[PDB]
Amino acid sequence: MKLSLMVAISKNGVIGNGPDIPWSAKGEQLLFKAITYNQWLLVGRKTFESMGALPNRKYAVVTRSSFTSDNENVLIFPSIKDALTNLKKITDHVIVSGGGEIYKSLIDQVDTLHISTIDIEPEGDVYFPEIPSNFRPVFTQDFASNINYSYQIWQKG
Amino acid sequence: MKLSLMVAISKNGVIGNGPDIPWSAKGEQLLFKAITYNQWLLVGRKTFESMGALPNRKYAVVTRSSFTSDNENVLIFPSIKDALTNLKKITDHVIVSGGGEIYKSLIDQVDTLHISTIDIEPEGDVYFPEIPSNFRPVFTQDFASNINYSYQIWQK
Ligand SMILES: COc1cc(Cc2cnc(N)nc2N)cc(OC)c1OC
Ligand SMILES: COc1cc(Cc2cnc(N)nc2N)cc(OC)c1OC
């Protein structure tokens, strides 16, 4: 089972996924929409609830809180280990789509990073982890917008 | 100036960018939208007429047919060579976005390939070129849809 990771960060590494983040870049969220189309997303509870169950996405929500769903496209798992073991029987591909601690728990295990860097250095309390040494960038593209952004794909060797 | 190339093809290499393609995959066009946002696209006359001006794109149309657009985000050039030399002064990135003849002329000169392969074998006269051997795939992802499709990025 291939594991991807997708995140939007400021230049300083503040996580910019969230709903009412005021330094969002018009056009960047198109990348997230394109890459996650009919994909399994591994997310924590806060990420699921902020995002909602978007069309054409399937959700593995990891929480040991008493979270509940009646959406057949939303599975709940007490741990990452339990999520991964169970998705191995369901799909070939899972995209880790956030939570600070979700990303910190998993970044060493994933094969591919999809990183959007917004060209701003704002104040935040939740940072993306340092990219490990055994990842290398294999594609980069710049976008002019209200705030400029860069899209970069990394691969583990 | 980096040159990228973006296309949607069948599994037998038939070009499937067009407006009324029966074998178009739900979702795949999201990739084109995301990669082309506030980019310069290099296209032929036909591709530009079919596509019209989607907003938040700028267009370099190459044609020898003295084509006329009354449109803010379009520049007309007589050749590919003439287009690239003027764009070099205006932008650091152009995305070659179609005409089979456009793709044929430029594929050997571009740096990055964006290929969506739709899982089907229709008939058609306009094929995409064979991929020069100096290109390697650096990224693959598969999509289940009404017709399955694969997105692949190649680097020179
Ligand atoms: C599409 O809406 C959301 C998406 C995400 C996750 C996310 C968003 N953008 C990027 N580039 N990567 C991600 N993993 C997170 C969200 O809230 C925390 C969202 O709600 C606005
Ligand atoms: C978004 O609309 C169009 C886009 C294109 C070009 C194009 C379309 N899809 C992909 N994957 N790559 C491309 N270069 C070509 C078109 O018609 C010829 C379009 O009109 C529907």
Numbering used by the authors:
A (entry chain A): 1 to 157
B (entry chain D): 1 to 156
Sentences from the paper on this structure:
The crystal structure of DfrA1:TMP, determined to 2.2 Å, shows the antifolate interactions in the active site more closely resemble the binding mode observed in DfrA5 than in EcDHFR. Similarly, electrostatic interactions between Glu28DfrA1 and the diaminopyrimidine ring dictate the ligand binding mode. Additionally, critical hydrophobic contacts are lost through the L28Q substitution. Excitingly, there are structural differences that rationalize the higher levels of TMP-resistance observed with DfrA1 compared to DfrA5. In DfrA1, a bridging water molecule facilitates the interaction between Glu28 and TMP, representing a loss of direct H-bond interactions. Another pronounced difference between the DfrA1:TMP and DfrA5:NADPH:TMP complexes is seen in the Met20 loop. In the DfrA1:TMP complex, this loop takes on a conformation reminiscent of the EcDHFR occluded conformation with the Met20 loop occupying the NADPH binding site. The direct effect on TMP binding is through interactions with Met16DfrA1 that result in a 2 Å push and ~90° rotation of the trimethoxyphenyl group as compared to the DfrA5:NADPH:TMP structure, correlating with a >3-fold increase in resistance between the two enzymes. Moreover, binding of TMP reorganizes DfrA1 into a conformation similar to the occluded conformation of EcDHFR that involves a notable shift of the Met20 loop. Of the ~500 structures of DHFR from various organisms available in the PDB, this is the first isoform of DHFR evolutionarily distinct from EcDHFR reported in the occluded state.
